């Protein structure tokens, strides 16, 4: 998986409710989070699928 699989999820500012993916490195798989709607870091995925190909290996 790259480096920013290992990130915390994260939020950003913006005031929407839009749920998203992150790779959770400690448990091993993906999990969902708040997505505020802008400034997006890269562990912030639509789905559990993408998530996981990109972050679960290598």
Do not use: H, M, W
Request: glycine share 10%.
């Amino acid at each position: 998986r790259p480096d920013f699989c290992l990130e915390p999820p994260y939020a950003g500012a913006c005031r929407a409710r839009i749920i998203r993916y992150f790779y959770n490195a400690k448990a091993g798989l993906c999990q969902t989070f708040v997505y505020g709607g802008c400034r997006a870091k890269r562990n912030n995925f639509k789905s559990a699928e993408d998530c996981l190909r990109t972050c679960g290996g290598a």
